[PDB]
């Protein structure tokens, strides 16, 4: 599914993301925008290290979900990577919460540092009633 912006914002709020480990809803929205365009079916293969990024947060198969064909996979979310291509994002959010429980937090995604860190991100939640 491709979420609309305020639909996603209200879904992430209800799933407990606002302020999780100190990260505002507008930062999560900026991360999802630049990672996938709010598309749950996004996948990106990294030819370089043979891993794939899945779903709305583009979570990688070397460390977080298992796809069976990533060498050096760890599966820290204890999830099949196909659970990150569902239209329902509850499992994607459970795993994104696991990623930011490591010391790096949201910086784990370089897209967040390039497009969201030290920028005005208020625009992503404006008008959504969150």
Swiss-Prot record:
SMART domains: LYZ1. SUPFAM superfamilies: Lysozyme-like. GO terms for cellular component: azurophil granule lumen; extracellular exosome; extracellular region; extracellular space; specific granule lumen; tertiary granule lumen. It is found in: Secreted. CDD domains: LYZ_C. GO terms for biological process: antimicrobial humoral response; defense response to bacterium; defense response to Gram-negative bacterium; defense response to Gram-positive bacterium; inflammatory response; killing of cells of another organism. The active site is at residues 35, 53. Pfam families: Lys. It catalyses: Hydrolysis of (1->4)-beta-linkages between N-acetylmuramic acid and N-acetyl-D-glucosamine residues in a peptidoglycan and between N-acetyl-D-glucosamine residues in chitodextrins. Keywords: Amyloid, Amyloidosis, Antimicrobial, Bacteriolytic enzyme, Disease variant, Disulfide bond, Glycosidase, Hydrolase, Secreted, Signal. Residues 1-130 form the C-type lysozyme domain. It comes from the Eukaryota. InterPro entries: Glyco_hydro_22, Glyco_hydro_22_CS, Glyco_hydro_22_lys, Lysozyme-like_dom_sf. Disulfide bonds join 6-128, 30-116, 65-81, 77-95. GO terms for molecular function: identical protein binding; lysozyme activity. Its main location: secreted. Its EC number is 3.2.1.17. The keyword Metal-binding does not apply. Monomer. Belongs to the glycosyl hydrolase 22 family. Lysozymes have primarily a bacteriolytic function; those in tissues and body fluids are associated with the monocyte-macrophage system and enhance the activity of immunoagents. Lysozyme C is capable of both hydrolysis and transglycosylation; it also shows a slight esterase activity. It acts rapidly on both peptide-substituted and unsubstituted peptidoglycan, and slowly on chitin oligosaccharides. It is linked to Amyloidosis, hereditary systemic 5: A form of hereditary systemic amyloidosis, a disorder characterized by amyloid deposition in multiple tissues resulting in a wide clinical spectrum. AMYLD5 primarily affects the viscera, and the predominant clinical features are renal dysfunction of varying severity, and intra-abdominal bleeding. Inheritance is autosomal dominant. This is Lysozyme C. The gene is LYZ.
């Amino acid at each position: 599914k491709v979420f609309e912006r305020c639909e996603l914002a209200r879904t992430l709020k209800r799933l407990g993301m606002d302020g999780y480990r100190g990260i505002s809803l507008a930062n999560w929205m900026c991360l999802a925008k630049w990672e996938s365009g709010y598309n749950t079916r996004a996948t990106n293969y990294n030819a370089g290290d043979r891993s794939t990024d899945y779903g709305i947060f583009q979570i990688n198969s070397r460390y977080w979900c298992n796809d069976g064909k990533t060498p050096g996979a760890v599966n820290a979310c204890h999830l099949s990577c196909s659970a990150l291509l569902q239209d329902n994002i509850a499992d994607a959010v459970a795993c994104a919460k696991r990623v930011v429980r490591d010391p790096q937090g949201i910086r784990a995604w370089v897209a967040w540092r390039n497009r969201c860190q030290n920028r005005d991100v208020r625009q992503y939640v404006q008008g959504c009633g969150v």
